[PDB]
Symmetry: D2
Subunit: 202 residues, 4 copies
Amino acid sequence: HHHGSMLFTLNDPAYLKTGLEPAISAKTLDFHFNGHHKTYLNKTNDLVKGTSLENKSLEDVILVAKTTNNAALFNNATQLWNHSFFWDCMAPTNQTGQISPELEKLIKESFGSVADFKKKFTDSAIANFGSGWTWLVNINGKLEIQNTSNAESPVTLRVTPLLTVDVWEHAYYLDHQNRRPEYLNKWWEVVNWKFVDQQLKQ
Amino acid sequence: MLFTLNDPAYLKTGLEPAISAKTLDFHFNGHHKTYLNKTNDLVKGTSLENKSLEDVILVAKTTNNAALFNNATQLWNHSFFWDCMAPTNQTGQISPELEKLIKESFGSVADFKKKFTDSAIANFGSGWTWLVNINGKLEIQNTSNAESPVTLRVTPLLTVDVWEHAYYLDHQNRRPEYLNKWWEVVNWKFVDQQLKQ
Amino acid sequence: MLFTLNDPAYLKTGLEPAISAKTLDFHFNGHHKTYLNKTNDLVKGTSLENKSLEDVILVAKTTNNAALFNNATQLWNHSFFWDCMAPTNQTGQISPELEKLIKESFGSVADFKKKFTDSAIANFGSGWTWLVNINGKLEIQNTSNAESPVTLRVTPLLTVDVWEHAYYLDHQNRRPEYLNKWWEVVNWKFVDQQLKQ
Amino acid sequence: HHHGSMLFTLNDPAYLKTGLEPAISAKTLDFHFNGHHKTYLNKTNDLVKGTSLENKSLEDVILVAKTTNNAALFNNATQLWNHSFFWDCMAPTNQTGQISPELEKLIKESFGSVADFKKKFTDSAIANFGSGWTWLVNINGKLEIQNTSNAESPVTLRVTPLLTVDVWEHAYYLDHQNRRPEYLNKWWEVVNWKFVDQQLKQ
Ligand SMILES: [Fe+2]
Ligand SMILES: [Fe+2]
Ligand SMILES: [Fe+2]
Ligand SMILES: [Fe+2]
């Protein structure tokens, strides 16, 4: 069938060892990336080998898992994608850039103001019960805030994800314990707005 | 501009032996127009006015709006469903490209039909059974109630409706008999056109 | 020993104008007996032999056994459904006890019926709409597919089946008209007995 | 209308300050009980007061939330109950007691052996994806293992809960981070078997 075996791989986030203070500590990123993310990577790779999914791209694996209702594969493959997306969403504070004019317009149009968007994104992330994610998605020029639970993700949907925050407790418990609002508040300072704008141009 | 529907071409003729014109009257003039009315009502006076149905569906899904998602997606599902069928003498045939991908994912066309049929039979409650194209690999997907691959980064090729209203008047609980007769009204040229858009 | 059903006393007469004898023919002899045989098939050769249907349902629910849960609970749901109805001349009345709890919980019987009815209309897809007693406080519950309060620490008082097969032959897409006329067959004697013991 | 208003309350677990080493540290119990459990208690009391659920038992409030699909009420009220049950399920390693011959009888029958039960329960709890709980329940004399998600709980069901472990990440992340198997491994050493026996015989 093939003799060109491939697996998924992960590269260190550039800020892995220095951290994302004051939002996310270097300690948290160690357990988050070397623990959770690599666990999802190894499990996705184990479940796909020796099957018709070997060598398929991660997004094809995610959509096959979703359409065939394969829970174990969906949970690991989509968690593998969500964290890779999550790392691009953030940067050390001095390297975040700013909201582009074009992106600022669509935030105003969909939410009134940038300040209002942040509060509604934050309140939505706080209200997201249990493990999951809160997303900013672009629907053909209209922006929306989406909550998902556990590994569910808009990567499966006909939308463009612009931004996500992880509210699984492992994303913040070492630094913030039960104070998720304090986690989300400081997380705004590490949002990589250069990436959000680049996601908008596609 | 409100969303609108046009009668399926075979509305008065029916799709015997799968679906009678009687059933099509209730299915289109009842259920499908009901979904159309609710959708227009839910969108009227909102920021969703003058947006496509697909945008309306994805807005409903991403914002977890059940009432809007259920009616707008059901509105899309039936329009796709009607396009998937034709009277037995106007079905066309499975294209060489499509047979090729069917054989790849399921071995043979006969095997595909079998598994597709078993999947629709196993689909408990209300819902739909779909054939989708995932970047060159075909898959059979069951969805519940109004759920639909129209939300997903996949291409739907074919669907059969297994809500009981799609078949109860002609077949009552004989859903297997509905599905196997349903194969005779599959609009294969539509399926092939979905593969090559 | 394996589970059994006995014919509803009114199987040949129907519940006109709510449910015809024909609908009852497919509803009982088709679906309900199908759920019975599959429940019987799944518990045969297993540790569930000898256990009551309720134990089987709770075992299926706690172990996430979908096939066993769907069949066994639908098997219970339909039995409870039949006892909830009677021919229009044999429905009995709302007792003073139940009437007090209805207006305590819902304001008036008129507001209750409207809201129970509005609830069943809103119960999207296949499912059931229930009146339940929670230690003296009553509530309206919507469930999907085979889901049921029989698993819960509540006492069920009344249910209407809104699977489309429950009503499609008599009312097709007119679920409100099925519910409107379903009220005339509510075995209000039975609902009051559920309120005791 | 009456003149004896009531509220839900919590008492400190007896081991709150000593901890449950090596399974759960005193620091975790501080955030878990004083943080999470008390937050669930105040939200439950705040949601019911001034309503027709005021002065109703915790179990009645839960079934009303569940039957009427009241998400905010169900999540807080049921989590209030889940943790209270969880604290009774545990005791310091020197005060756990032993499995009674009658409880041992039902375990062997439903699971083959006590060794096989612990593995199944542990494997079930490791596979419980996201936030949730893993339970041992008695169904009219037959025992079963149940996984639930987020706040879901057999307190809603016509069964007797015998034992639960909390697998929300806040239950273990400060002591064990992503090593949930190691948390569950040590958690067996703090299981209060005499509480499990009392649940069976009541
Ligand atoms: Fe994470
Ligand atoms: Fe339909
Ligand atoms: Fe039914
Ligand atoms: Fe907890």
